[PDB]
Amino acid sequence: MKTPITEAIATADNQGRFLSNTELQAVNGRYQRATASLTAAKALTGSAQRLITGAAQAVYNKFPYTTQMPGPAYASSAIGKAKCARDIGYYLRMVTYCLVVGGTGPMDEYLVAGLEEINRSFDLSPSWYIEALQYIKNSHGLSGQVANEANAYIDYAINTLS
Amino acid sequence: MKTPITEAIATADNQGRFLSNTELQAVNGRYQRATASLTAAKALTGSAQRLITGAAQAVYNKFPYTTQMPGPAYASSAIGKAKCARDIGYYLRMVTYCLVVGGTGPMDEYLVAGLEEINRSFDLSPSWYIEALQYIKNSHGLSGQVANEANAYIDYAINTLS
Amino acid sequence: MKTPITEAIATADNQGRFLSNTELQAVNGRYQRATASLTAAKALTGSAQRLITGAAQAVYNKFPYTTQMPGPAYASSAIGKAKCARDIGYYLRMVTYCLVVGGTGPMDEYLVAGLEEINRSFDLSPSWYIEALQYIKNSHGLSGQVANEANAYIDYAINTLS
Amino acid sequence: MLDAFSRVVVNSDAKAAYVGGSDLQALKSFIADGNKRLDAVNSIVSNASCMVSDAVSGMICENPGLISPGGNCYTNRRMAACLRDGEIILRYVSYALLAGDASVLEDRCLNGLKETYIALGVPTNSSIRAVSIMKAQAVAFITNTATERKMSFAAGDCTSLASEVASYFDRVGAAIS
Amino acid sequence: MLDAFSRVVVNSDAKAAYVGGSDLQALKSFIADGNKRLDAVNSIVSNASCMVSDAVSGMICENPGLISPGGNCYTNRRMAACLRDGEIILRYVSYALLAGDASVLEDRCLNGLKETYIALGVPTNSSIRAVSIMKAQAVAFITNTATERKMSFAAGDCTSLASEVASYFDRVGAAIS
Amino acid sequence: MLDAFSRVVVNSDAKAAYVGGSDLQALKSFIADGNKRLDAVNSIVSNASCMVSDAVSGMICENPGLISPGGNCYTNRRMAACLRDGEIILRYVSYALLAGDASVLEDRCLNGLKETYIALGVPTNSSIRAVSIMKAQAVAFITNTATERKMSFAAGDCTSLASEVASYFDRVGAAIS
Amino acid sequence: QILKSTKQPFLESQLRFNQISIKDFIKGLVLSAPFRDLNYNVNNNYRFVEICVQRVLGRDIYNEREKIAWSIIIATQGLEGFIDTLLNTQEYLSNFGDSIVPFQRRRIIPQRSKGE
Amino acid sequence: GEEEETVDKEAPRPELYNKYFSADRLHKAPEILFEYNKTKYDRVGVRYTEVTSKASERFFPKSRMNRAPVIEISYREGAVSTASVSLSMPEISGPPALPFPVPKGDVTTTMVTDPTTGRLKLEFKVDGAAVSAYSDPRA
Amino acid sequence: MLDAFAKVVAQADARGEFLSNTQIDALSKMVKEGNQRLDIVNKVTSNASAIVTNSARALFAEQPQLIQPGGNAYTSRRMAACLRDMEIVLRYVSYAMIAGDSSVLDDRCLNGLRETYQALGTPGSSVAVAIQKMKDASVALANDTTGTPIGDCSSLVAELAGYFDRAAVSVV
């Protein structure tokens, strides 16, 4: 995963050099912004079941065909609505994994790479998940730079789908 | 010349990427070691005049043969000493240049790149040159973290010749 | 552009080979099915305005939200419906180009390469075009081996959207 | 428009100011021998950096105990602080030359400097030797009788202004005695 | 945000915090004559370094036994502590000018101030003499009636805020009376 | 050749619109600031003999290997040409700023001088050290902070304009690069 | 790994403008950031040499000492110093050159049908 | 040896001030900041930092510390219509530092000029500086 | 690459001397605005696919001759390569926002960009009018008062315009 630590290590064995002070400052700036990051990952984990079931309902209010179309790709079954709710469980879990390590490493490894090939093979529209993520982005209730860190990894998940 | 800003850019470009929050934190730590490195190379120019030949006399009183040997590659006569107000002033110049950029930039390409070819084919052995800036690392007159950041790129230049 | 003729040239050019009896049956078998494929291209050309507008309405009957939802990616306006009829006319034109050359050359070059960059950017769903092409597949009204050639290059386009 | 000059020197911060062509005629008319005086401040501050580098090294050249370990020109911040104390008095004596008085020299620079130097351990008779070179160096630049440099000037004498800085440099030496 | 002014102080912690342009007029509508009052602080804190130096040296040059060996303004650690001591009572009276009440000045600075000075042997008759020069400076700077530095202001009267700071300096002198 | 007034026309041509009030707001403020630019370029062309004096006698003291017998400015035709090669390239940027567009600089000289110069044998790093010695020579003159000659302008701040002649001369040096 | 995220759309355009060669295009793919985190972080230096000789040179490894003899190039001067000393070998130039995408040379015996 | 005085603390300080002034709340005062420039972005701010002082500031306080009025004069010969005087007092630093004692080796060191610091390498008057006088091929 | 600190190193290395004291207090002014630089690059790259597709959509509206058949941006290969180059300028402008100078934008992206376009035949006047949509969609994006506290950042938004007009005059 690409953290700010593991990219400072990565430029060192690029050249095969030792760890100088052109990489200690990269880890130093990570430790500054990790105190406004783990206060964000704590609050998203604590209100996770409020955010997930509120974001499934924001998709179903905007796209009411998905609750009533027959077929396997839609959440009109009992098992269609469970697969929808664990998908927004997966999109919130990779945001709090990315806030902990301080970079887009876990959602590059687990969400982003290979996403187009499974949304095309299983007929999942990528505008569903932007509406599930736009509900989270202005109703987590955070305030300040703790809000400014959650609105950079939710917005990174949107720009992959957008 | 590898500024810590410029490898946040160059390790956002070889992957073909916008500047994410990973590389935004590494330039924040460059803005955190900014003021504690900028008092170093400012005031090292303010005490630069003693440090050139006050370190040169810390070589000839270590090595009496360097004034006594018959050869072109020493400071024996009056023409070798005029190179010795130049060839160790280049070591004093680039240690100020590294504290401007907050990394090991300018001496990585101007000084250390292709240096054993200059050393072996002039017989300019660095047993003088390590002790040429070993007077600088303890008689600079600096305290605090301004001392440790000014001493950070001096002993990178020590270990590249040692 | 891969044709049967510009593929057997390429395997002849790989081996430095004059066009043997191996490559003179790959180009002969194109001539024994250029009869049936050029009547299918002539029939789909004449019934274009029946098949384009009929498939544009069969999309809107299956997916009624596309005529209702606001915003520029949908068929809820006059110019939104005109760009949807342009798109099925772009799709049906490349089916007839493949029946001329005898293979999937012109829809590889002009249609398929770079298509997923558009459908993610402009928020267009790939299942809007399966329903448009599954209309054209079983409403062109052809029969026999004339239908076998038109039904080969229609579901090549379904498999590059799926 | 010396009130515009005095408001620059009273605000106790860094602030740039400059004079156009109309107010320079108000400067040349209010201050007597302004064609002479503005030459005399320009002959010093063109070579003010060599004047502070020669004189305190001439103070080293006669008193070599200051660069001893334990001396007051050791520990190169403190050596540069003697160079920083070299350069303030040259800018202050040039404005004392320009205003025609020492009333800006006494309050902003000379008030309590003797008590400052005996509280900081500064050898004040060594600085008397350093400032007596400055009285010789300013006279040879005002009269243009420097041995190594000669600047172009208009013809005539400047011996009133050459004697006026000797009145101003003796006020510094009386203040630190 | 007046509480968030106080929340710089009351959490005992070194931060930096500001008030923007839209957030200014909420305080400016609330605090009466806030265009006068923000001028009243800015007349003081632009000369906050010069206000302590004329205050302490007038205490020295009127009471000359304080700089004696044995006096309480000898031994330059003790001199620098007294210059530090005049700064903290200047910033606390400047923050009392901003907040409009002395109730943050009374507990943070003046509480326990009386017997902590005879704990160290501070001559408090000189300290009341020291703060009275700052009482004369702050009525000169706010009314723009300083004898050497005038500043540019909007035209008007400021005699209420001249009397308020002169009330607030008297709470300092009564705390060490 | 393009004009800035012509620049909004081809902006409005492939767009196939008319001229609206929206992009018109840049050009009407360009009219009233036209005299300020007209107060700039008259002093660029009237001190041009000094700017081609210090173009070539300044770059030759920091690499004197061209006046050496065998160098690339040794003979008195190449001595004459280097005086001549620099006085055309500041004549072209005096044309380029009145239009505002750099394309008149590009099509006339900056398309292909680099391909000639390695067949004419001259080094490009010597050229950009002689390009940039006219760069700071230019930007003193537009602001009136030049030392030995101070000229007549009005009072203001043309640092938006002073970046523009610095926005030309790097692309002068990058063309040879 | 020919996914949408693992494509190199700026390296693809410089091939089509004939700015870089095939030999500079293979060098951009080993130094690509998908090739690091998927094929270089999950094996050691003695297995990664078995990848960069099977795929780049198109031959098998000779014996196990060649994996020992090559793996110090990656640990001293890096992966970017490892590919250009592998693309300047005579085995790369004498049958691929500056214009051929490499391939597995002589996988099968011509009378047979099984091979390697 | 440049700062061999990094901690030295001979203040007596018996602990009889702790019941009236705490250790964390010691010599700390609210400093008020002003970005007052008659502009839309004019901010007022307060911050609460440690207060330090030095013993020199009876007569040379921190605003007037090392601020001396410099004079820059542009004057060509007979060019009084474009000649000008300027006046400012910045935080003025001195020249670069004095060198080694030096016996007579190569050349002490120097520095001069406006753009950059230059610096050469003159032994005692003569300024050798890389001409390579040892030029002896062996034919 | 070079940033602003790498300027005066190489602007004094050929000059020879050390860093003079009158320059670096302007450079320690730049670290006061270091926190108002990094929000602002975070304002651009969070919306980095909503400035591209909202301005290519407003490009083909006013110029229908590019998406018409036989146009330059007609096919799906050449539509994807039109949205590719519209995002490439959005990277290298925001690279020049974080650094302090132009010299990575016009050395890696603008050095021959119009002469790339004269060889391919794309209308080089029309890429400038898509960039000037992206200039107005980003300068007006970087003046919001949500997410940051308020204060005058009027000095730093002229630098964001000044590289967007540098790509507007590079391509014609």
Ligand SMILES: C=CC1=C(C)[C@@H](Cc2[nH]c(/C=C3N=C(/C=C4\NC(=O)[C@H](C)[C@H]4CC)C(C)=C\3CCC(=O)O)c(CCC(=O)O)c2C)NC1=O
């Ligand atoms: C704007 C800036 C400004 C200045 C710098 C001065 C410069 C200055 N001084 C004089 C004119 C003069 N300048 C001098 C001064 C000197 N002559 C010497 O031999 C001494 C070395 C030196 C004194 C230090 C004298 C003696 C005269 C003639 C008498 C006089 O006009 O005062 C002239 C006129 C020259 C002429 O008649 O052609 C000028 C331009 N005046 C200014 O307005």
Ligand SMILES: C=CC1=C(C)[C@@H](Cc2[nH]c(/C=C3N=C(/C=C4\NC(=O)[C@H](C)[C@H]4CC)C(C)=C\3CCC(=O)O)c(CCC(=O)O)c2C)NC1=O
């Ligand atoms: C090692 C021991 C050592 C010294 C004792 C002094 C030597 C020295 N030089 C000058 C004297 C001077 N020094 C200068 C200064 C300068 N001249 C110039 O042309 C430059 C612009 C500038 C820096 C070199 C001037 C102008 C004089 C007066 C004229 C002269 O005697 O040269 C004086 C004062 C006159 C006197 O009383 O003798 C002394 C003591 N310098 C030393 O290094």
Ligand SMILES: C=CC1=C(C)[C@@H](Cc2[nH]c(/C=C3N=C(/C=C4\NC(=O)[C@H](C)[C@H]4CC)C(C)=C\3CCC(=O)O)c(CCC(=O)O)c2C)NC1=O
């Ligand atoms: C040696 C003995 C010695 C003294 C007797 C005092 C001198 C002194 N000055 C002031 C008085 C003052 N002091 C200042 C302060 C300043 N004025 C400025 O222009 C600067 C900005 C700032 C630092 C100098 C101001 C503004 C006044 C009030 C104006 C005035 O009456 O002088 C006062 C109080 C008024 C009074 O006289 O009652 C005294 C006692 N200082 C000494 O050192």
Ligand SMILES: C=CC1=C(C)[C@@H](Cc2[nH]c(/C=C3N=C(/C=C4\NC(=O)[C@H](C)[C@H]4CC)C(C)=C\3CCC(=O)O)c(CCC(=O)O)c2C)NC1=O
């Ligand atoms: C951001 C920081 C900030 C400030 C520093 C103040 C500054 C300030 N004060 C006033 C305006 C004023 N300021 C004063 C104050 C004074 N006038 C005097 O004659 C005395 C010398 C001095 C007393 C201390 C007075 C009397 C007015 C006019 C009445 C008023 O508006 O309060 C005005 C409006 C001026 C105008 O537009 O006409 C401003 C901007 N306001 C701010 O928002």
Ligand SMILES: C=CC1=C(C)[C@@H](Cc2[nH]c(/C=C3N=C(/C=C4\NC(=O)[C@H](C)[C@H]4CC)C(C)=C\3CCC(=O)O)c(CCC(=O)O)c2C)NC1=O
């Ligand atoms: C190497 C040998 C050598 C020279 C030939 C001179 C030439 C010279 N002049 C200037 C520097 C300058 N040169 C000029 C030009 C002029 N000033 C005027 O007012 C006149 C009208 C005009 C014709 C002489 C200007 C305006 C400056 C900037 C300094 C200033 O005046 O502010 C510079 C510094 C520019 C740089 O390198 O970055 C140099 C090298 N000085 C030298 O060291």
Ligand SMILES: C=CC1=C(C)[C@@H](Cc2[nH]c(/C=C3N=C(/C=C4\NC(=O)[C@H](C)[C@H]4CC)C(C)=C\3CCC(=O)O)c(CCC(=O)O)c2C)NC1=O
């Ligand atoms: C648009 C403007 C413009 C020009 C620059 C010239 C371009 C140009 N320059 C030179 C020619 C030259 N130009 C230079 C000048 C220089 N070489 C150096 O080493 C220095 C870096 C630099 C001085 C600053 C020299 C020295 C010659 C050589 C003349 C010769 O070879 O005889 C020639 C050859 C002339 C001939 O063969 O007759 C031409 C066409 N023409 C133009 O219309």
Ligand SMILES: C=CC1=C(C)[C@@H](Cc2[nH]c(/C=C3N=C(/C=C4\NC(=O)[C@H](C)[C@H]4CC)C(C)=C\3CCC(=O)O)c(CCC(=O)O)c2C)NC1=O
């Ligand atoms: C016949 C020849 C001819 C000219 C020389 C110009 C003359 C000229 N200059 C300006 C006017 C001006 N010129 C400047 C320019 C500057 N001021 C500075 O402080 C900088 C040093 C410099 C460049 C940045 C400024 C600031 C103004 C005033 C603003 C304005 O009205 O334009 C004006 C308008 C006001 C006036 O009438 O004076 C005119 C006509 N036009 C002409 O037709």
Ligand SMILES: C=CC1=C(C)[C@@H](Cc2[nH]c(/C=C3N=C(/C=C4\NC(=O)[C@H](C)[C@H]4CC)C(C)=C\3CCC(=O)O)c(CCC(=O)O)c2C)NC1=O
């Ligand atoms: C929170 C608010 C706050 C303050 C108000 C000051 C109060 C204060 N002052 C001093 C300490 C001191 N204060 C003075 C000041 C003076 N003595 C004189 O003779 C003059 C009259 C006057 C200066 C003008 C001196 C000289 C000392 C040091 C005494 C010593 O160390 O011997 C101490 C030291 C004891 C300790 O640290 O516990 C404290 C708390 N400091 C604070 O933290």
Ligand SMILES: C=CC1=C(C)[C@@H](Cc2[nH]c(/C=C3N=C(/C=C4\NC(=O)[C@H](C)[C@H]4CC)C(C)=C\3CCC(=O)O)c(CCC(=O)O)c2C)NC1=O
């Ligand atoms: C506005 C008034 C004003 C001045 C007059 C100068 C003077 C000055 N110099 C120093 C400070 C100093 N001044 C010197 C200077 C010297 N010591 C020597 O042995 C030489 C004789 C002489 C140089 C030629 C030294 C060595 C220090 C260092 C002491 C220190 O840093 O603590 C200090 C600080 C002392 C303190 O903190 O209290 C001041 C105010 N600066 C000013 O702001």
Ligand SMILES: C=CC1=C(C)[C@@H](Cc2[nH]c(/C=C3N=C(/C=C4\NC(=O)[C@H](C)[C@H]4CC)C(C)=C\3CCC(=O)O)c(CCC(=O)O)c2C)NC1=O
């Ligand atoms: C890793 C990413 C990263 C960032 C992007 C910045 C984000 C950031 N900005 C501010 C803080 C601020 N940020 C702004 C900025 C703005 N206000 C505006 O009107 C403009 C739209 C915008 C500039 C682009 C202002 C005005 C402040 C408060 C003033 C100040 O910084 O002191 C703060 C609080 C700390 C501080 O005050 O400096 C932080 C963390 N820092 C980071 O670590």
Ligand SMILES: CCC1=C(C)/C(=C/C2=NC(=C\c3[nH]c(/C=C4\NC(=O)[C@H](C)[C@H]4CC)c(C)c3CCC(=O)O)/C(CCC(=O)O)=C2C)NC1=O
């Ligand atoms: C952690 C990274 C990760 C992602 C992103 C992921 C997506 C993912 N979503 C899937 C299915 C699905 N996703 C949905 C979701 C929805 N349908 C709706 O109607 C709603 C509008 C919407 C969201 C609420 C449905 C109904 C299926 C089942 C479709 C099928 O099986 O054909 C499947 C098929 C297998 C399955 O889970 O049954 C994958 C692989 N899997 C992953 O491991």
Ligand SMILES: CCC1=C(C)/C(=C/C2=NC(=C\c3[nH]c(/C=C4\NC(=O)[C@H](C)[C@H]4CC)c(C)c3CCC(=O)O)/C(CCC(=O)O)=C2C)NC1=O
């Ligand atoms: C990239 C920066 C840089 C490096 C690393 C460098 C090394 C270097 N040192 C040199 C010479 C020299 N350097 C010295 C200095 C010394 N020799 C001693 O024995 C003394 C102990 C010591 C004095 C402190 C001397 C005496 C020569 C002359 C040798 C000769 O020319 O024969 C030379 C020959 C050219 C010259 O005369 O300068 C080079 C290239 N030069 C550079 O520009």
Ligand SMILES: CCC1=C(C)/C(=C/C2=NC(=C\c3[nH]c(/C=C4\NC(=O)[C@H](C)[C@H]4CC)c(C)c3CCC(=O)O)/C(CCC(=O)O)=C2C)NC1=O
């Ligand atoms: C020949 C290969 C080729 C393809 C496939 C192609 C697709 C293509 N379809 C587009 C738009 C569009 N396509 C649609 C089509 C639809 N939306 C609906 O609601 C309907 C369900 C559906 C029609 C079946 C709409 C509404 C737009 C406009 C999107 C916008 O303006 O933002 C656009 C954006 C430009 C435009 O036409 O205005 C492209 C490039 N272009 C090509 O060159």
Ligand SMILES: CCC1=C(C)/C(=C/C2=NC(=C\c3[nH]c(/C=C4\NC(=O)[C@H](C)[C@H]4CC)c(C)c3CCC(=O)O)/C(CCC(=O)O)=C2C)NC1=O
């Ligand atoms: C490293 C950064 C980088 C730059 C600067 C770059 C420019 C660049 N643009 C290109 C093509 C192109 N660029 C465009 C774009 C446009 N034409 C129009 O008419 C519109 C106005 C505009 C889109 C909005 C088009 C249509 C092509 C042709 C694609 C092809 O012929 O395959 C090509 C030919 C290769 C290709 O992409 O197909 C290059 C090299 N490529 C890069 O990789």
